[PDB]
């Protein structure tokens, strides 16, 4: 039960207003580094690591 | 440490994260199913292509394609964040029925 459930995800999608026709904010790298930091720059996921990370929900 | 964290920026991050999670599952659904589904959620196509570009993108942070660098940073936080009190992840990781 490590993978996120689809039904819940859809609830999140609708509860966050993501089903509404809007523009997608273009977030800068710098803003994400501040509000969503990683231990260090060596931990930037690449390649298949990206898909694998979206499967899990630790 | 650095600048102060913006609650507005945090919300946009978890919105993009939720969209990325959807797109991935929206694609894995077609990767096992086989047939090409016509998803109607706004920007799903965009983030699907972002994901596909990012899996073989080599420019890292410097990249120009919109949402590539931000998505890499966000998904990287998603994986490495273990904290139970994280303001970005808590509504997502602790979502449930
Ligand atoms: Zn979709
Ligand atoms: Zn790129
Ligand atoms: Zn977090």
From Swiss-Prot, chain A:
Intracellular or extracellular location(s): Cytoplasm; Nucleus; Nucleus speckle
Domain of life: Eukaryota
Effect of residue 32 to A: Blocks increase in transcriptional activation caused by nitrosylation
Cysteines engaged in disulfide bonds, as pairs: none
Post-translational modification: S-nitrosylation of Cys-32 may be responsible for increased recruitment of p300 coactivator necessary for transcriptional activity of HIF-1 complex.
Annotated stretches, region: CTAD: 28-58
Inducing or repressing factors: Under reduced oxygen tension. Induced also by various receptor-mediated factors such as growth factors, cytokines, and circulatory factors such as PDGF, EGF, FGF2, IGF2, TGFB1, HGF, TNF, IL1B/interleukin-1 beta, angiotensin-2 and thrombin. However, this induction is less intense than that stimulated by hypoxia. Repressed by HIPK2 and LIMD1.
Residues recorded with modification (3S)-3-hydroxyasparagine: 35
Annotated positions of the S-nitrosocysteine modification: 32
TM region(s), chain numbering: none
Tissues in which the UniProt entry reports expression: Expressed in most tissues with highest levels in kidney and heart. Overexpressed in the majority of common human cancers and their metastases, due to the presence of intratumoral hypoxia and as a result of mutations in genes encoding oncoproteins and tumor suppressors. A higher level expression seen in pituitary tumors as compared to the pituitary gland.
Domain characteristics, as noted in the entry: Contains two independent C-terminal transactivation domains, NTAD and CTAD, which function synergistically. Their transcriptional activity is repressed by an intervening inhibitory domain (ID).
Protein purpose: Functions as a master transcriptional regulator of the adaptive response to hypoxia. Under hypoxic conditions, activates the transcription of over 40 genes, including erythropoietin, glucose transporters, glycolytic enzymes, vascular endothelial growth factor, HILPDA, and other genes whose protein products increase oxygen delivery or facilitate metabolic adaptation to hypoxia. Plays an essential role in embryonic vascularization, tumor angiogenesis and pathophysiology of ischemic disease. (Microbial infection) Upon infection by human coronavirus SARS-CoV-2, is required for induction of glycolysis in monocytes and the consequent pro-inflammatory state. In monocytes, induces expression of ACE2 and cytokines such as IL1B, TNF, IL6, and interferons. Promotes human coronavirus SARS-CoV-2 replication and monocyte inflammatory response.
Subunit structure as annotated in this protein's UniProt entry: Interacts with the ARNT; forms a heterodimer that binds core DNA sequence 5'-TACGTG-3' within the hypoxia response element (HRE) of target gene promoters. Interacts with COPS5; the interaction increases the transcriptional activity of HIF1A through increased stability. Interacts with EP300 (via TAZ-type 1 domains); the interaction is stimulated in response to hypoxia and inhibited by CITED2. Interacts with CREBBP (via TAZ-type 1 domains). Interacts with NCOA1, NCOA2, APEX1 and HSP90.
UniProtKB/Swiss-Prot annotation, chain B:
Amino-acid positions noted as binding Zn(2+) 3 in the UniProt annotation, renumbered to this chain: 77, 81, 86, 89
Entry binding sites for Zn(2+) 1: 22, 26, 39, 44
Positions annotated to bind Zn(2+) 2: 53, 57, 63, 68
PTM note: Methylation of the KIX domain by CARM1 blocks association with CREB. This results in the blockade of CREB signaling, and in activation of apoptotic response.
Protein role: Acetylates histones, giving a specific tag for transcriptional activation. Mediates acetylation of histone H3 at 'Lys-18' and 'Lys-27' (H3K18ac and H3K27ac, respectively). Also acetylates non-histone proteins, like DDX21, FBL, IRF2, MAFG, NCOA3, POLR1E/PAF53 and FOXO1. Binds specifically to phosphorylated CREB and enhances its transcriptional activity toward cAMP-responsive genes. Acts as a coactivator of ALX1. Acts as a circadian transcriptional coactivator which enhances the activity of the circadian transcriptional activators: NPAS2-BMAL1 and CLOCK-BMAL1 heterodimers.
Oligomeric and partner information: Part of a complex composed of MSX3, CREBBP/CBP AND EP300/p300; the interaction with MSX3 decreases histone acetylation activity. Interacts with DHX9 (via N-terminus); this interaction mediates association with RNA polymerase II holoenzyme and stimulates CREB-dependent transcriptional activation. Interacts (via transactivation domain and C-terminus) with PCNA; the interaction occurs on chromatin in UV-irradiated damaged cells. Found in a complex containing NCOA2; NCOA3; IKKA; IKKB and IKBKG. Probably part of a complex with HIF1A and EP300. The TAZ-type 1 domain interacts with HIF1A.
Listed name of the protein: Histone lysine acetyltransferase CREBBP
């Amino acid at each position: 039960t490590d993978f996120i459930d689809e039904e819940v995800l859809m609830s999140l999608v609708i509860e966050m207003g993501l089903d509404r026709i809007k523009e997608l904010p273009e977030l800068t790298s710098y803003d994400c580094e501040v509000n969503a930091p990683i231990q260090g720059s060596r931990n930037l996921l690449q390649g298949e690591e990206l898909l694998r990370a979206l499967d899990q929900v630790n | 440490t650095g600048p102060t964290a913006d609650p507005e920026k945090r919300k946009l991050i978890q919105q993009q994260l939720v969209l990325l999670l959807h797109a991935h599952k929206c694609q894995r659904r077609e990767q096992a199913n086989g047939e090409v589904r016509a998803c109607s959620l706004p920007h799903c196509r965009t983030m699907k292509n972002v994901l596909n570009h990012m899996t073989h993108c080599q420019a890292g942070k410097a990249c120009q394609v919109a949402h590539c660098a931000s998505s890499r940073q966000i998904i990287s936080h998603w994986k490495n964040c273990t904290r139970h009190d994280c303001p970005v992840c808590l509504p997502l990781k602790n979502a449930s029925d």
